[PDB]
Amino acid sequence: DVYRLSPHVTTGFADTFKESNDIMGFSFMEKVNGAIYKYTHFAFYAVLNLLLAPFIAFSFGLSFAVMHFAVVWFVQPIMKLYYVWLRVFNLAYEPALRLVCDPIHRSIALILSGIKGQFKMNSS
Amino acid sequence: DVYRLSPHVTTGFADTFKESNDIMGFSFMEKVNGAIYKYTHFAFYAVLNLLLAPFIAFSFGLSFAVMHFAVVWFVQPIMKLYYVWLRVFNLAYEPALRLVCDPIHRSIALILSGIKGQFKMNSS
Amino acid sequence: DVYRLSPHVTTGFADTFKESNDIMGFSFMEKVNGAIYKYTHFAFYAVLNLLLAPFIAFSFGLSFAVMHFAVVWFVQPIMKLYYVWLRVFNLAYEPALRLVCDPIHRSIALILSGIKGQFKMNSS
Amino acid sequence: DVYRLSPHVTTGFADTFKESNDIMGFSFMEKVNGAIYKYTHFAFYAVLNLLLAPFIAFSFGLSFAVMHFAVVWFVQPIMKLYYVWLRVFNLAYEPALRLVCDPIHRSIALILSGIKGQFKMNSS
Amino acid sequence: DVYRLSPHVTTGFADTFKESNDIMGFSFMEKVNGAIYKYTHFAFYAVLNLLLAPFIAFSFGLSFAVMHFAVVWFVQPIMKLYYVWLRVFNLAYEPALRLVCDPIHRSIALILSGIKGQFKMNSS
Amino acid sequence: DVYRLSPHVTTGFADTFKESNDIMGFSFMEKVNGAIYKYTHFAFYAVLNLLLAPFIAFSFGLSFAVMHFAVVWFVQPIMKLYYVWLRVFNLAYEPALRLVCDPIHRSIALILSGIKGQFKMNSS
Amino acid sequence: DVYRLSPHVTTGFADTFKESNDIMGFSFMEKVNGAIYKYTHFAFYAVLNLLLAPFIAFSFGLSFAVMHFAVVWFVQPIMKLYYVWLRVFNLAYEPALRLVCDPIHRSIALILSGIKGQFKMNSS
Amino acid sequence: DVYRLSPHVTTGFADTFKESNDIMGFSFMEKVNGAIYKYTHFAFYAVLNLLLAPFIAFSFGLSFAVMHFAVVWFVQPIMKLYYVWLRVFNLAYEPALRLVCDPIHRSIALILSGIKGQFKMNSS
Amino acid sequence: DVYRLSPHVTTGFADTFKESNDIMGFSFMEKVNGAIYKYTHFAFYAVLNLLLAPFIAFSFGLSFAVMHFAVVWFVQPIMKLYYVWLRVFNLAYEPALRLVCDPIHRSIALILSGIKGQFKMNSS
Amino acid sequence: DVYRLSPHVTTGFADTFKESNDIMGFSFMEKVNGAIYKYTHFAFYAVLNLLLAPFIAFSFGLSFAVMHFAVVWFVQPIMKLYYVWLRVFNLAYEPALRLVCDPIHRSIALILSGIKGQFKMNSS
Amino acid sequence: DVYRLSPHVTTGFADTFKESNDIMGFSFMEKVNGAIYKYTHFAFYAVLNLLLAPFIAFSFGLSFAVMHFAVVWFVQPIMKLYYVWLRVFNLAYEPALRLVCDPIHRSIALILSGIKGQFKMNSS
């Protein structure tokens, strides 16, 4: 699928404040920092979602409805008529080109008709 | 098939307002937002379809009827006559070109007639 | 076959007014729209076919008869005489070219006569 | 065979007035149109064949007789003498060219005499 | 994943003050040096972490909350509309280009339709 | 064989006045036309052969006798002496060229001595 | 690992004062020379290590502590924000480029769709 | 063998006055023509051979005797001395060139040391 | 290993005063010459080794001690800090380049997605 | 072997006065001509060999003795000293070049580390 | 081995005065000529070897002793110090180059990630 949104960027605590085996502090502070980060993030995202989510959903639902009706019932039939004319053109175009092109490429194919070889193998 | 309409763009709620394991709000708001979006979309598309669909179908059915009659009963026989003349031309064109081209390419094919080699293999 | 007419453009109702899982109206309107489209198309194509088909068939049958007689009984024997002369020319042309060309390409073939190699493989 | 006439162009009724599953008229008219086309074609070709075929056959038989006698009994022996002289020239031409060419191409063949490699494979 | 932080740089004592079999001092000094290095590193990192970690976590949690809300609920729907228009353009663009391009590349494909060869193998 | 005459051009009745399944006349006229063509061809070729064949055969037999005696007993020994001198020249030419050429091409062969790879396969 | 220190230079006695089977002195002098070299090297390296090692270890431990704190807690979050913006740009960039590029490369792929060949093998 | 005379040109009756299945005269004339040709050729070649063969054989035997003595006992030892000097030159030439060339080509060989791949297969 | 001394030059008596099967003197002189050469070589190398070896060993042991201390305890930590900065730069550099480069190369990969072929084999 | 004399030129009676199946004289004359040729050749070569062979052998034996002594006992030791100096130069030359060259070619090797493919096969 | 003397030039009697099956003299003279050649060669080489061999052996033994002492005990340690500095330079050089080069070559590797194909085989 070409029109699929690519995956998000990992942002978890251990994926953004990342340490190796050589880097350490006190053990108990890790949980405190992680809890602070996670709860701040959640508490600030949730209120915005609750306050502003419905209106955007309504607006974009209505907009997509109109867009999809237009596409399905005015664009596709026109494209089909266009395709009819394209086929009519191809009927005249393709054979005429093949006439002049095919003999040359059939002739050039004779370069690969003389292969011969000998081989010997060993193993242990 | 060349003249086939390509697949649509995914637009479902979870495919347009997409989140990862790091992004969350309150659980119950998800269903509310999804229901609002889906029902708005359906209720706005259905009325337009009901009101305006039949006339477009009638018009394009009539148009396609005329187009297809023209194509089937005036274009294809003409193309067949054209093809007859094309074959007549090929009869004279192809052998004359092959005469001058084939000897050269048969001669050049001799470059691949001297392959020899030796090999040894091991495994464990 | 070079002179074969390419396949038609799909034009069925579900192949021109095409929808996905995300796009829906009322269920019953689909059958109404499909019936309107199909019956309009058929009723408009059938009358034209009935009224105008025979004359075109007669005319093109007569035309093709004349064309094919001309091709079979005046063009092909002439092409055969032409081919006789072409063979006579080739008898003199091909050996003379091969004389000067073959030694060079036989000599160049010696580039591929010194292949050697060693290998070892593993698997699990 | 180089001097063989290429196959004809398909011209049958269903191969020139061609329809798909989407294109239809009344059922009975198809047989009427096909019969009209086929019988017109046959009735117009047969009379011309009967009236004019024998004279063309006689003329071209006589012409081909003369042509083939000329080719068999005056051209081929001359070509054979020409070939004798060609062989005499090759005797002097080929070894002299091979003298100067072969050492270089034998030397260049040493580029492919140092292949070595290692591999490992897995499967499941 | 494109947006993943690359692994750290190894900095352990034996990985930064590295010696070979040819380089040696007294045995007991190795432990003294290693202990000094490790404990200095830990004692200086831990205090900074304890003193300054929470505020940075809070700030970046709040910042990421705002950023992610913006991305999820204002950018993606706009991109989806953009994709709708892109599909509409492709419907007209692709077949027209394929019409003129495909015959040429189908014709050029005939260069690989004349392969022949002979081989002989030996083993021991 | 380089000096072999290439095969004739097919000229039989059904190979020069050729028809397909779509092209037909009355059945009985086919045999009449074929008989006329074949018998005219044979009756015109046979008399010419009978009247003029022996003299050409005698003349070309005598001519070829003289030509072959000249070739066998004056050209080939001279070519053998020429070959002796050619070998004498090669003795001095080839080693001197190989001296300067071989080291370079042995050196360039080292480009293919570092191949390594890993693979994994699946099947069902 | 990109940031790993490469292996040392071999410096052992037999690896720096190296002889072959053709080069020999008295047997007993080899041990004397080896002992002198090894003990001088060890006695001069050990005192320097003992005298100067601890201070360098302390200094670099403190320095690395500060550096790693800076990297972990000020650089990585900024890079993550940068990555968010990069993803937003890619959403608009990639599909638009693929629209114009893919048809051409799909068309060019038709060059490899006409392969045919025949082979014969022998063994002993 | 480089100095071997290439095969003669076929000149038999059926190989120079050649006909196909489409070309025929009276049956009995074929044997008459063949006998005339063959006996004329033989009767004219045999007398010349008998009259003039011995003197040419004597002359060329004497000439080849002198030529071969010269080659065997004056040219080959001189070529051997020349070869001695050539070897002396190679001793100095080859190692010096390999010194400057080999490192570069060993270095360039590293381009083929990073191959990896995955595959899947199906059959029926 | 890059910093390993390459093998010596063979200098044994039979490897420097080398003869073939065609070159011979009296048998007993070979042993005399070999003994003279070998004993002169050994007697002249041994005294120099005994007289001058220890001082060079002492000097180079001391020198290498100082060099290795400098390398291990002043260069490597600095290189590690440099590597830290290099990683910090890469974090910003690599994703930005991949953004603009990957779509193009993914698109160009479509040239190899249309392979088809047919084959036939024989053996005996 | 580079300094080996290439094989002689075939000069036997049937290999220099060569005939095919189409060329014949009286049977008995063949033996007469062959005997004359062979005996003349032998009788003229043998006397020259007997009269002049010993002196050339003596002269060239003496000459080769002097040449080979010079080569074995004055050229080869000098070449060995030259080789010693060459090795000394290589010790300094090769690592320095590899330093600057290897990283680039290791980097360029990454072009072949992304191979993937799918296949399907059929047989009968 | 690079510094190995290449094999001698064959000089035996039958390898320098070489004849084929077509070239012959009296049988008994062959042994006389061979004996003369061989004994002259041996008798002239042996006296020179006996008279002049020892002094050259002594001189070159002494010379090689001095040369090898110099190489082993003054050149190799210096080269080792040089190698230490070379490694120090590489530590800084290689990662910096890999930083800018690797992303580009990883990106270009995506050209080989789209292979697909179909095949059919036959045998008899």
Residue numbers in the entry:
A (entry chain F), B (entry chain G), C (entry chain H), D (entry chain I), E (entry chain E), F (entry chain J), ...: 29 to 152
According to the publication:
Caveolins are a unique family of membrane remodeling proteins present broadly across animals (Metazoa), and in vertebrates form flask-shaped invaginations known as caveolae. Unlike vesicle coat proteins such as clathrin, COPI, and COPII that cycle on and off membranes and share evolutionary origins and structural features, caveolins are unrelated in sequence to other vesicle coat proteins and remain integrated in membranes throughout their life cycle. Using a combination of computational and structural approaches, we now show that caveolins across evolution share the ability to assemble into amphipathic disk–shaped multimers composed of spiraling α-helices and a central protruding parallel β-barrel. Each complex forms a disk with 11 spiraling α-helices and a central β-barrel, with each protomer forming contacts with two protomers to the left and two to the right.
We used single-particle cryo-EM to determine a 3.1 Å resolution structure of the S. purpuratus caveolin complex and built a model spanning amino acids 29–152. Residues 1–28 and 153–159, regions predicted to be disordered, were not visible in the map. The complex, ∼130 Å in diameter and ∼36 Å in height, is composed of 11 spiraling α-helical protomers organized into a disk with a protruding β-barrel. The variable N-terminal region extends along the cytoplasmic face of the complex before making a 180° turn at the hook structure. Amphipathic α-helices form the spoke region, with the α-1 helix forming the rim of the disk that is ∼15 Å in height, and the C terminus of each protomer is a β-strand that forms a central parallel β-barrel ∼30 Å in diameter. An unstructured detergent micelle covers the hydrophobic face of the disk and reaches into the interior of the β-barrel, suggesting both regions interact with membrane. Comparison of the experimental and AF2.2 structures shows the computational model did not correctly predict the length of the β-barrel or the curvature of the disk. 2D averages of vitrified S. purpuratus caveolin complexes showed variations of curvature, including examples of complexes with either concave or convex curvatures. Calculated using a filter resolution of 8 Å, these low-resolution structures represent the negative and positive values along the reaction coordinate for the component with the largest variance. This analysis shows that the S. purpuratus caveolin disk can be concave, similar to the 3.1 Å structure, or can be flat. Thus, we conclude that the S. purpuratus caveolin complex is more flexible than the human or S. rosetta caveolin complexes under these experimental conditions.
